[PDB]
Motif scaffolding. Structure first.
Motif, PDB file in Angstrom:
ATOM      1  N   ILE A 128      -9.425 -11.584   0.102  1.00 63.80           N
ATOM      2  CA  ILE A 128      -8.365 -10.935   0.875  1.00 63.80           C
ATOM      3  C   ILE A 128      -8.441  -9.420   0.723  1.00 63.80           C
ATOM      4  CG2 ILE A 128      -5.900 -10.641   1.109  1.00 63.80           C
ATOM      5  CD1 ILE A 128      -5.594 -13.547   0.261  1.00 63.80           C
ATOM      6  N   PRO A 129      -8.559  -8.662   1.814  1.00 64.81           N
ATOM      7  CA  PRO A 129      -8.611  -7.199   1.695  1.00 64.81           C
ATOM      8  C   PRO A 129      -7.239  -6.559   1.584  1.00 64.81           C
ATOM      9  CG  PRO A 129      -8.958  -7.830   3.953  1.00 64.81           C
ATOM     10  CD  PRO A 129      -8.889  -9.112   3.173  1.00 64.81           C
ATOM     11  N   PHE A 130      -6.985  -5.849   0.485  1.00 63.35           N
ATOM     12  CA  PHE A 130      -5.694  -5.189   0.330  1.00 63.35           C
ATOM     13  C   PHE A 130      -5.670  -3.836   1.031  1.00 63.35           C
ATOM     14  CE2 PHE A 130      -2.520  -6.986  -2.675  1.00 63.35           C
ATOM     15  CZ  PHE A 130      -3.030  -8.257  -2.683  1.00 63.35           C
ATOM     16  N   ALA A 131      -6.739  -3.057   0.904  1.00 60.68           N
ATOM     17  CA  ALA A 131      -6.861  -1.777   1.589  1.00 60.68           C
ATOM     18  C   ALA A 131      -7.945  -1.894   2.650  1.00 60.68           C
ATOM     19  CB  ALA A 131      -7.185  -0.655   0.607  1.00 60.68           C
ATOM     20  N   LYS A 132      -7.573  -1.654   3.901  1.00 59.65           N
ATOM     21  CA  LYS A 132      -8.447  -1.910   5.031  1.00 59.65           C
ATOM     22  C   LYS A 132      -9.631  -0.951   5.039  1.00 59.65           C
ATOM     23  CE  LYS A 132      -5.540   0.963   7.965  1.00 59.65           C
ATOM     24  NZ  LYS A 132      -5.192   1.591   6.661  1.00 59.65           N
ATOM     25  N   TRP A 154     -11.658  -7.847  -8.537  1.00 55.81           N
ATOM     26  CA  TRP A 154     -11.421  -6.830  -7.522  1.00 55.81           C
ATOM     27  C   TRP A 154     -12.737  -6.170  -7.143  1.00 55.81           C
ATOM     28  CZ3 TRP A 154      -6.684  -5.961  -5.276  1.00 55.81           C
ATOM     29  CH2 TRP A 154      -5.574  -6.501  -5.918  1.00 55.81           C
ATOM     30  N   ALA A 188     -15.310   7.351  -2.076  1.00 59.89           N
ATOM     31  CA  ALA A 188     -16.001   7.727  -3.301  1.00 59.89           C
ATOM     32  C   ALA A 188     -16.283   9.217  -3.395  1.00 59.89           C
ATOM     33  CB  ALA A 188     -17.313   6.953  -3.423  1.00 59.89           C
ATOM     34  N   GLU A 200     -12.265   1.771   6.195  1.00 60.36           N
ATOM     35  CA  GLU A 200     -12.122   3.020   6.925  1.00 60.36           C
ATOM     36  C   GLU A 200     -13.463   3.732   7.004  1.00 60.36           C
ATOM     37  OE1 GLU A 200      -9.196   4.853   8.668  1.00 60.36           O
ATOM     38  OE2 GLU A 200      -9.538   2.690   8.828  1.00 60.36           O
ATOM     39  N   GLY A 228      -9.586   4.524  -2.521  1.00 57.23           N
ATOM     40  CA  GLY A 228     -10.015   5.496  -1.539  1.00 57.23           C
ATOM     41  C   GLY A 228     -11.525   5.631  -1.523  1.00 57.23           C
ATOM     42  N   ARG A 246       0.834  -1.199   0.000  1.00 52.91           N
ATOM     43  CA  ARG A 246       0.000   0.000   0.000  1.00 52.91           C
ATOM     44  C   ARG A 246       0.871   1.251   0.000  1.00 52.91           C
ATOM     45  NH1 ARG A 246      -2.763  -2.505   5.432  1.00 52.91           N
ATOM     46  NH2 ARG A 246      -4.129  -4.026   4.406  1.00 52.91           N
ATOM     47  N   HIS A 294     -17.795   4.696   3.000  1.00 58.47           N
ATOM     48  CA  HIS A 294     -16.822   3.669   3.347  1.00 58.47           C
ATOM     49  C   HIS A 294     -15.805   3.505   2.221  1.00 58.47           C
ATOM     50  CE1 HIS A 294     -20.414   2.676   5.747  1.00 58.47           C
ATOM     51  NE2 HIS A 294     -19.567   2.204   6.643  1.00 58.47           N
ATOM     52  N   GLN A 295     -14.690   2.848   2.534  1.00 60.67           N
ATOM     53  CA  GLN A 295     -13.649   2.645   1.537  1.00 60.67           C
ATOM     54  C   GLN A 295     -12.928   1.333   1.807  1.00 60.67           C
ATOM     55  OE1 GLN A 295     -11.183   6.113   2.156  1.00 60.67           O
ATOM     56  NE2 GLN A 295      -9.716   4.958   3.398  1.00 60.67           N
ATOM     57  N   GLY A 296     -12.431   0.716   0.743  1.00 60.55           N
ATOM     58  CA  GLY A 296     -11.771  -0.570   0.862  1.00 60.55           C
ATOM     59  C   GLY A 296     -11.503  -1.160  -0.505  1.00 60.55           C
ATOM     60  N   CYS A 297     -10.912  -2.355  -0.494  1.00 64.98           N
ATOM     61  CA  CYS A 297     -10.603  -3.064  -1.735  1.00 64.98           C
ATOM     62  C   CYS A 297     -10.347  -4.528  -1.424  1.00 64.98           C
ATOM     63  CB  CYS A 297      -9.398  -2.452  -2.429  1.00 64.98           C
ATOM     64  SG  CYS A 297      -9.232  -2.943  -4.154  1.00 64.98           S
ATOM     65  N   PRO A 324     -13.523   9.592   5.545  1.00 62.10           N
ATOM     66  CA  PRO A 324     -12.126   9.344   5.926  1.00 62.10           C
ATOM     67  C   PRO A 324     -11.186  10.329   5.257  1.00 62.10           C
ATOM     68  CG  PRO A 324     -13.223   7.302   5.412  1.00 62.10           C
ATOM     69  CD  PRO A 324     -14.147   8.392   4.971  1.00 62.10           C
ATOM     70  N   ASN A 377     -13.761  -2.962  -5.489  1.00 56.03           N
ATOM     71  CA  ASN A 377     -13.320  -1.654  -5.020  1.00 56.03           C
ATOM     72  C   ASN A 377     -14.536  -0.828  -4.631  1.00 56.03           C
ATOM     73  OD1 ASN A 377     -11.962   0.672  -4.478  1.00 56.03           O
ATOM     74  ND2 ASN A 377     -11.045   0.899  -6.508  1.00 56.03           N
ATOM     75  N   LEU A 378     -14.694  -0.558  -3.334  1.00 53.97           N
ATOM     76  CA  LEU A 378     -15.909   0.085  -2.847  1.00 53.97           C
ATOM     77  C   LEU A 378     -16.052   1.514  -3.345  1.00 53.97           C
ATOM     78  CD1 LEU A 378     -16.457  -1.204   0.763  1.00 53.97           C
ATOM     79  CD2 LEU A 378     -17.406  -1.941  -1.395  1.00 53.97           C
ATOM     80  N   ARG A 379     -15.005   2.077  -3.941  1.00 56.27           N
ATOM     81  CA  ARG A 379     -15.118   3.403  -4.537  1.00 56.27           C
ATOM     82  C   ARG A 379     -16.077   3.398  -5.721  1.00 56.27           C
ATOM     83  NH1 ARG A 379     -12.494   7.463  -7.843  1.00 56.27           N
ATOM     84  NH2 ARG A 379     -12.493   9.357  -6.561  1.00 56.27           N
TER      85      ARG A 379
END
Lengths: 234, 117, 250, 114, 237
Positions: C213-217, C178, A120, C219, A118, A65, C107-110, A201, C180-182
């Motif tokens: 597997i989550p790469f970006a935790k 993937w 949205a 938040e 990141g 990361r 929220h955010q993650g991947c 965040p 990606n919650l974005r």
């Protein structure tokens, strides 16, 4: 008729051998999916590149990361690394690297994909820069602006693709030769910062994938350096 | 075996700039001049090099923003400027010269820059 | 534009228009009379298998590490599929996997969703060997770990080695996607039958492993939901089993 | 910052006895293109100008006696004096000229044993 | 345009690599000395193991070449005029009888193909076909060998290649003659399926995938620090 060099065993010979088991009718082959015809089919797929291996993250997931945070950082550099696969500690462990290390001569171009993992609702800009082999890396955002650059808007676009070309006097460059200030640098700089709405965040993470284009060829098969052990197991 | 000279040892004062020149008995062709300081203990410490014939200037981070370099190749005399001198700078300031890319063959005579508060 | 799929006529499902990974490029299909060892013709029960077997919903949190299920055992008690696994000797099938997160835009993650074929797991103690219980529970999710596990008969649950000994950054070579919650919120993966023999016992062999597997935790700000649920759906396709009739005329 | 570490103790030996000293230049000093070691040993007469004794880590200096022999490769480097002398009092340093900054060693005085 | 012939599966897995070096006496000694044995497998040479484990399913023939070099041994009662030496090279397919010592009956079984090689010629070779029940060798197997869901985990599956044995035909009354065997192994007509990521941790077992938790890559000074490992020179003074 025959030279004394006719009776020899050359380890790189390809001659037919007598069959130990003739009249043995082998099992017919079925259609198991996913056959591979060429190891270059393996190096063209994306892999996550550990850009953040600062001696404390190599033993954790954190190595993958790239941290990005918003605040008073005006032009502080997000990341930067030298573009030399096969030898650079950033690249030598991925799929592309561990295919290249089996070979001694390599040719073609490379592809990097940055993905903004990141929120949205977070907006900002980033200035990716590329410096050719015959140049010193930038030190101020203005210097990286006046070279070759691309401006990435993380609000409009969520992924960026940067293709690093092939510039060399000779066709094949050796895999294991450290070209000091002759390989090229890739650096990313803050442009605006990071803007978030209330209740969201304030930090993000920019993953990076590296892969090959269609242009590679490799030559002079050899043995990998990564297998230090040599003894017969057990 | 060529000898080397400088301005000379002089008793200076606090905040009194000390100009230590370094005489030349060689050419100015891709060779270098630099200094080190001989304190009472721990030997020598480098202060900053200058390379005539290359127009290169560099300073040690222990003196960064505090010392400056000026040089005059034609007159065979080059300065090493300094200001805001403290009482702990008193040392034998040796001037070294190198006809090579990476070597330290030759050495200077020495200057005593003790002051009196 | 939500789309409603009702495979099995007894299961409801709503999903948006999305991209689909077809595994290794081959669509799952029945076994033909060309590549078969047994001239006895296998039967094809599909009346009740072709329905969405909704697994439990897990809770992605800020300190989670990863999860992984072993197929085909994960459907050991799921209705008629378990009945077929119990009542037949040799069986063969492909699968269709849907993974969905339900998270708002704050929220955010991947996540990485892979389907690794023939995943052999290393042991926590190098000299000993793993047991049957540590490879997979019935239909729950087994978890990875941040730090080395020092068990005696357990798999190696270190996340950055995937329990296999390869870098977790090089699992993209397998069928993957993937989340990606974005921008993205779902994953669909179609997996054919990959094995060296045309049919095999389901209980003795684990065909593949689903890994998340989550790469970006994850938040979030203080005022928000403490978790993001992850939901898994399977829909068996092209199932076959051996025949229990007397081939010899009687 | 490249660091060098001298031996913790000085000679502390009698006159004329073979002595071995070492400098550990942590950061690697071997250049791929040249296979050169950018480390030289120095002797410093107290009050006089110090001068190096063995340079390139393989070559004895001009005008330097045959008693001083310096070798080594990689991070470590070593020096041997076949017979120490009493009038050659100095403080032995090791200086690396690989990359900036130019760092001196730790020092090693020729103390008294008689 | 640049060719990709050098990276294909054939040119990547058809290098002859030595897999076994053994030695065996001729007359004097216990029975276990007089013959040399080896089970054919690719799980003990680490380099070959890594290259094969880059894939999951494989299908190939086998070409085996034997480089046998003999020599005399110091002692008492040395011979001066032994005419020649001959070696018997025996291939034992799975399901075949296995010798337990030299001068055993199993050395004369008509189902085991044998080569009688007299020293001085070109080294002996043989080519074993695809010998298995299933349709492909599988490097990685997830499951148990017995249907009762217990046994050895992911091992001793239906893939085998047999054994190979070498013995001195020439019974020698006087003196002992040592011999050394080197076995070169090469696959031919390779077909590979389902690629895998190359391994990271050091190999620890010749039957398991057990390992130690290792780091993912090599450490670096900083996140944004380029190399710059060039000393002082004419450029960059």
């Amino acid at each position: 008729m025959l030279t004394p060099g006719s009776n020899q065993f050359l380890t790189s010979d390809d001659f037919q051998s007598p069959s130990a088991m003739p009249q043995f009718d082998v099992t017919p082959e079925m259609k198991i999916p996913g056959e591979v015809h060429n190891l270059m089919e393996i190096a063209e797929v994306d892999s996550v590149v550990p850009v953040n291996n600062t001696k404390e993250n190599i033993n954790s997931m954190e190595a993958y990361r790239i941290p990005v945070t918003g605040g008073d950082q005006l032009h502080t550099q997000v990341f930067g690394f030298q573009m030399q696969p096969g030898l650079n500690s950033v690249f030598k462990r991925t799929l592309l690297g561990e295919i290249l290390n089996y070979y001694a001569h390599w040719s073609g171009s490379v592809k990097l994909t940055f993905v903004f993992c990141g929120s949205a609702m977070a907006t900002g800009k980033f200035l990716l820069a590329y410096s050719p082999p015959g140049a010193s890396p930038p030190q101020n955002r203005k210097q990286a602006m006046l070279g070759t650059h691309v401006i990435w808007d993380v609000g409009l676009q969520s992924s960026c693709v940067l293709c690093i070309p092939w510039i060399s006097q000779t066709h094949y460059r050796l895999v294991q030769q450290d070209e000091y200030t002759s390989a090229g640098y890739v650096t990313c700089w803050y442009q605006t910062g990071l803007i978030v709405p209330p209740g969201a965040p304030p930090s993000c993470t920019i993953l990076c994938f590296a892969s090959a284009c269609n242009d590679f060829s490799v030559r002079n098969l050899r043995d990998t350096p990564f297998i230090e052990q040599t003894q017969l197991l057990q | 075996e060529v000898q080397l000279q400088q301005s000379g040892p002089e008793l200076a004062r606090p905040w009194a700039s000390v100009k230590i020149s370094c005489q030349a008995f060689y050419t100015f062709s891709n060779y270098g001049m630099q200094w080190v300081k001989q304190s009472p203990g721990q030997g020598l410490e480098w202060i900053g090099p200058f390379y005539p014939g290359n127009a290169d200037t560099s300073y040690n981070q222990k003196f960064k923003g505090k010392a400056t370099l000026t040089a005059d190749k034609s007159s065979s005399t080059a300065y090493m400027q300094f200001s805001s001198l403290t009482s702990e700078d008193s040392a034998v300031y040796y001037c070294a010269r190198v006809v090579a890319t990476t070597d330290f063959d030759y050495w200077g005579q020495g200057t005593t820059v003790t002051v009196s508060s | 534009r939500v789309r409603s799929i009702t495979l099995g006529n007894s299961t409801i499902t709503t999903q948006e228009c999305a991209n689909v990974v077809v595994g290794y490029g081959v669509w799952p299909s029945y076994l033909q009379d060309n590549e078969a060892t047994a001239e006895d013709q296998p039967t094809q029960p599909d009346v009740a298998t072709c329905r969405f077997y909704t697994l439990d919903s897990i809770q992605w949190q800020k300190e989670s590490d990863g999860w992984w299920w072993k197929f085909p055992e994960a459907l050991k008690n799921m209705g008629l599929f378990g009945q077929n696994m119990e009542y037949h000797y040799l069986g063969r099938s492909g699968y269709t996997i849907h993974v969905q997160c339900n998270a708002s835009k704050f929220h955010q993650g991947c996540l990485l969703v892979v389907c690794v074929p023939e995943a052999e797991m290393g042991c926590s103690d190098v000299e000993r060997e793993v047991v049957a219980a540590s490879l997979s529970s019935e239909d729950t999710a087994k978890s990875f770990s941040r730090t080395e596990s020092n068990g005696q008969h357990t798999v190696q649950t270190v996340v950055y080695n995937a329990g296999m000994g390869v870098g977790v950054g090089n699992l993209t070579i397998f069928p993957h996607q993937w989340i990606n919650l974005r921008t993205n919120n779902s994953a669909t993966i179609v997996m054919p039958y990959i094995n060296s023999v045309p049919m095999d016992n389901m209980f003795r062999h684990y065909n593949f492993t689903l890994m998340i597997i989550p790469f970006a935790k994850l938040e979030y700000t203080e005022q928000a939901s403490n978790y993001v649920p992850i939901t898994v759906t399977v829909a068996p396709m092209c199932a076959e089993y051996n025949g229990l009739r007397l081939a010899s005329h009687q | 910052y490249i660091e060098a570490s001298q031996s913790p103790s000085s000679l502390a030996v009698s006159v004329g006895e073979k002595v071995t000293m070492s400098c550990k230049s942590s950061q690697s000093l071997l250049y791929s293109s040249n296979q050169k070691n950018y480390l030289a040993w120095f002797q410093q007469k107290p009050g006089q100008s110090p001068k190096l004794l063995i340079y390139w880590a393989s070559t004895r200096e001009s005008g330097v006696p045959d008693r001083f022999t310096g070798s080594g490769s990689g991070t470590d480097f070593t020096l041997t004096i076949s017979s120490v002398k009493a009038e050659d009092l100095a403080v032995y340093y090791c200086q690396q000229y690989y990359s900036y900054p130019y760092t001196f060693g730790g020092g090693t005085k020729l103390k008294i044993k008689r | 345009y640049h060719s990709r012939t050098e990276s294909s599966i054939e040119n990547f897995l058809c290098r002859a690599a030595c897999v076994y070096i053994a030695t065996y006496a001729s007359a004097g000694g216990t029975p276990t000395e007089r013959y040399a044995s080896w089970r054919i497998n690719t799980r003990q040479m680490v380099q070959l193991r890594r290259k094969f484990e880059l894939f999951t399913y494989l299908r190939f023939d086998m070409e085996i070449t034997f480089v046998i070099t003999s020599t005399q041994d110091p002692g008492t009662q040395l011979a001066q005029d032994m005419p020649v030496l001959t070696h018997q090279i025996m291939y034992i397919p799975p399901g075949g009888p296995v010798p337990n010592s030299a001068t055993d009956f199993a050395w004369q079984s008509s189902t085991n193909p044998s080569i009688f090689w007299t020293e001085g010629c070109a080294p002996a070779r043989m080519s074993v076909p695809f010998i298995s029940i299933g349709n492909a060798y599988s490097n990685f197997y997830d499951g148990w060998s017995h249907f009762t869901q217990e046994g050895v985990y992911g091992f001793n599956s239906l893939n085998n290649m047999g054994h190979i044995y070498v013995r001195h035909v020439n019974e020698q009354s006087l003196g002992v003659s040592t011999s050394t065997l080197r076995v070169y192994f090469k696959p031919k007509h390779v077909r590979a399926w389902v690629p895998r990521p190359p391994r990271l941790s050091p190999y620890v077992k010749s039957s398991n995938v057990n390992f130690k938790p290792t780091a993912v890559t090599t450490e670096r000074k900083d996140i944004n620090d380029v190399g710059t490992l060039r000393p002082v020179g004419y450029t960059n003074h």
